[PDB]
Amino acid sequence: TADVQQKLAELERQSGGRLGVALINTADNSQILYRADERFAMCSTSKVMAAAAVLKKSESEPNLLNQRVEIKKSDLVNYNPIAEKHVNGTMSLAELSAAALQYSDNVAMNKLIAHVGGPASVTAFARQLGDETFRLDRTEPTLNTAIPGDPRDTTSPRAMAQTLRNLTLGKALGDSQRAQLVTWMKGNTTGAASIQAGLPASWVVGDKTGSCGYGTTNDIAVIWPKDRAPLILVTYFTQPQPKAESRRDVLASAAKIVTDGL
Ligand SMILES: [Cl-]
Q1: Spatial distance between the Cα atoms of 169 and 203, rounded to a whole number of angstroms
Q2: What are phi and psi of 205, to 5 degrees?
Q3: At what angle do helices 2-15 and 248-259 cross, to 10 degrees?
Q4: Distance CA 93, CA 111 (A)
Q5: Which is the catalytic residue, given 44, 46, 104, 194?
Q6: 180 with 55: CB under 8 angstroms?
Q7: Interval between CA 150 and ligand 1 midpoint (Å)
Q8: What is the H or E stretch that residue 92 is in?
Q9: 241 CA distance to ligand 1 middle (Å)
Q10: 127-144 as b/e: b if 16+ CB within 10 A
Q11: Are the C-beta atoms of 21 and 219 separated by less than 8 Å?
């Protein structure tokens, strides 16, 4: 409705920044879009694509998720909540995937990236799925600069919503791998203040958040409303000032606007 568009424009104006939304409602195959073809820095929301690339590789390598990866001091980056506890030992690729997706651990992201061949390999995986918009250019932590106008490490709301639908509800991954990705995302510990905060308490959510430079504040989610077909929702948000603070409330407000009614 124009009403939903007006409400999103009002929210964006009040927020002071630039808001991007894509909702896919699988009940009727409809979409609600706002700036959905513009690019936004992904921040840690790119961890979903990297974990999915590892899952895809595991379809033909059954030992892959159990493979051990050494964690060294030289692996530490800016935010390492799980990896810092494993320095001088190993973690499996499954454990790194869970740490990336559920605690936003940046060492874990770098190990997923390295395993599949680097940022260009993660990007080539997106391309193989039919996502011609996603680009992972850099590793952690430099992928977080989020400079306005810089296309590095960006995607669009439309593209990420369509790809997340393929990954979590469609057939991008084998049944075992899809279920594993969904379980990991449903177990996220970092999302309660973002999309989830704009939805009724009873709804079930798997999501991945990310915040980075220029007050960029993001969330991408698969949502099971009570007794309804699932939704896919991407809410991206960025601000003019380099040191702007995160605005998870803006993502909650956008989620409420686009799901009201339903
Ligand atoms: Cl500033």
Answers
A1: 17
A2: -135, 135
A3: 170
A4: 8
A5: 44
A6: yes
A7: 18
A8: strand 90-92
A9: 4
A10: eebebebbbbbbbbeebb
A11: no
Residue 236: helix, strand or coil by DSSP? strand
Neighbours of 102 (CB within 10 A): 20
Residue with tokens 């992201």: 109
CA-to-CA distance for 140 and 57, rounded, in angstroms? 21
Residue 150, SS3 per DSSP? coil
Q: Which residues hold their Cβ within 5 A of ligand 1, which is an ion?
A: 241-243
| Resolution for this experimental structure (Å) | 1.2
Task: Identify the CA nearest to 254 among candidates 190, 199, 191.
Answer: 199
- Distance from Cα 135 to the centre of ligand 1, integer Å: 26
State yes or no: is 44 an active-site residue.
yes
CA distance 211 to 238: 9
Method of determination? X-ray
The alpha carbon of 145 and the centre of ligand 1 are apart by a number of angstroms equal to 13
| Pairwise CA distance, residues 53 & 129, whole Å | 10
Centre of ligand 1 from the C-alpha of residue 147, in Å: 12
Measured between alpha carbons, how far is 187 from 102 in angstroms, rounded to an integer?
A: 6
Strand partners, 238: 18
Looking at domain 2-259, its CATH architecture is 3-Layer(aba) Sandwich (3.40)
